[PDB]
Design a protein around this nucleic acid. Sequence first.
DNA 1: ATATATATATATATATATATATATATATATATATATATATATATATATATATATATATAT
DNA 2: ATATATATATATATATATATATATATATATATATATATATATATATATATATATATATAT
Lengths: 47, 320, 151
Amino acid sequence: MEENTRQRTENYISAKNQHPAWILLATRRAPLVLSALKTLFEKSHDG
Amino acid sequence: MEENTRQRTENYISAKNQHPAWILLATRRAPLVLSALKTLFEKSHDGIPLEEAIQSLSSILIEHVSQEQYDINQDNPFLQASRELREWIKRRLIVERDGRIFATDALEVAITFVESLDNRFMTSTASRLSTVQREIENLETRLNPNPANRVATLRRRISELERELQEAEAGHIEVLETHQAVEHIRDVYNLASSLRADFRRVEDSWREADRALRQSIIGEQYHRGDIVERLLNDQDALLNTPEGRVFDSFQQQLRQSSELKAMSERLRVILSHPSASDALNRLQRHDLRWLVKRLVDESQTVLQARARSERDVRGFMKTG
Amino acid sequence: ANRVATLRRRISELERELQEAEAGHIEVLETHQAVEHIRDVYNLASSLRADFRRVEDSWREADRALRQSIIGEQYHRGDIVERLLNDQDALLNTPEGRVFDSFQQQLRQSSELKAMSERLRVILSHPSASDALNRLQRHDLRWLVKRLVDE
DNA sequence: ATATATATATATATATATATATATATATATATATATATATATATATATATATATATATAT
DNA sequence: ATATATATATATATATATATATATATATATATATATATATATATATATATATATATATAT
């Protein structure tokens, strides 16, 4: 199980520097972008 | 409706600047803190006792002292563990209670997010659709009061179960093939783990309601006769809110020791099946094995925590 | 024998409920209990689409890898056919692949999915639905099956 | 014999100096979101030329 | 007679320039975060003066 301990930190760091979602939530301007995007995408479901 | 969008950006800025989970996610050192806390709390049944927390967190810090780019300490991992623990407590990210520290709701949300983030075994299994279908069946068949509808539903159900009884008696019973069974096991674990999800939201709601009551009590001239009823009406108002209502309904449902006895006996056999080891590793297997005890203990803890609010009335009404 | 006994007792439970209903003691969900009972269903459904969002990516990556390896010179015609078959089978045997396969089996036995969508229509017409869920969520839960079939 | 009153005993509360541990204000280093700039691409218009198809006079 | 071939018209493509919007890149000012001096709190050894008290003298 010890791998699950250390390798997990590398998983999290790679997610922090790569995954778009976590990158977005970290930006200084996140809430405006997130609110605007949800407003756009809530009212229509086909694109 | 989109008039609220103006208000929604304000709501999100407020959440960004206040909610501890989001602030944590935004920090430079976020992955280290989240990994350390996940490792620490993976083994908690109650709030982990403080001393155990310090020791095990020092060991975890030792695990990652190699990462010098994060300014990790290299003279006393025990002191570093204690310092980090108090720092996190200051961040409203973990709370002391009875000397046993617990994970606030913020950390639970952050951990669930980051865990769901990566490629992994996914949240839903192949059995999720069948679960939803069964639940929809029950919900619809119970929502409508038309007695003809209910009797027809029961007639078709009873005919189907008579078919199944005849089939099984004749000997054509059927069982889950291995890879179907593993998926069902995993879905069961995922459903079950959601019960713990909100034992910490309820306590925060109690805390805030009690704080609001005491704060409004600043206008002492109100009638204490009002509070002779407000003792129950606090719970009543939070029973108009989902928190108190659903938590107390959950308590009532959980108090039915017969169904819980059935659930425990069935958990035991499902976990004794060979594919259990396939579906779930050691940690998950133990966690599910005595989920019932976890729920009972932690709900008892929540009740004994709301006991302080129960005493709030004696701290308000009495002015000797 | 365990299955036989379980059926023997479940049949008696539904017999008890049938006796209660025929006597006139039909019981509805308490007009507040039905509220949370509905958002519970919505929460269960909330992950079903989320997982398909990753089934999509898994298959996209499989296709891209196959296309890239086709430009690979080392492969005979037989090797490329083998790569296609084995990549598809491997993708299908992963958890998300099993999600897709179960969805496909349900499509085969379409009666149950149609019944589910009919039940959803009935559920959302109830007044309590408006209290439990805002309109967008009700819309999503109504056309869950459509969304999956499109995805 | 029980009750008032005695010198000394139990033992601590308080006091001081000392160290170590923690909380704070402040300075300072690195990461960040954004402003400015040059080359690139887009589309616009103005004009020339190429092209297909036709009008007309012609070959045999 | 039928079909050939050139001059003609018109629909389309190509060249060129203007202006605008763009992408890559540099540098800037901004914010997070770490490090530090410093003050304050927690705990401790050593000891005093104290309150409570035993043990105790004295009394009716």
